[PDB]
């Protein structure tokens, strides 16, 4: 129902990784999101997709 939200929260850290955060690492039911302040940009796109996927069922 709403599993992409958890890491989408990780996105929150990720967008922060760009400045505040530094390294995000989460566990999902299909893929893994482990990133730092080097690929977080490319990741933010991936996580951004994730984000938009959040609350897929409301």
Curated annotation (Swiss-Prot):
InterPro entries according to UniProt: GpW, GpW_sf
One GO BP: viral life cycle
Places the protein is found: Virion
Primary residence: virion
Keywords noted in UniProt: Late protein, Viral capsid assembly, Viral release from host cell, Virion
GO cellular component term, pick one: virion component
Any matching Pfam family: gpW
Position of the signal peptide: none
Assembly notes: Monomer in solution, assembles into hexamers on the prohead. May bind FII and portal protein (Potential).
Family according to the record: Belongs to the lambda phage gpW family.
Role description: Plays a role in morphogenesis of the virion head after genome packaging. Presumably interacts with the portal vertex to stabilize the packaged DNA within the head after packaging. Probably binds to the head-tail connector protein FII.
UniProt protein name: Head completion protein
Gene: W
């Amino acid at each position: 129902m709403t599993r992409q939200e958890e890491l989408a929260a990780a996105r929150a850290a990720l967008h922060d990784l760009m400045t505040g955060k530094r390294v995000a690492t989460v566990q999902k039911d299909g893929r893994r999101v482990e990133f730092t302040a080097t690929s977080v940009s490319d990741l933010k796109k991936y996580i951004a997709e994730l984000e938009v996927q959040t609350g897929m069922t409301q």
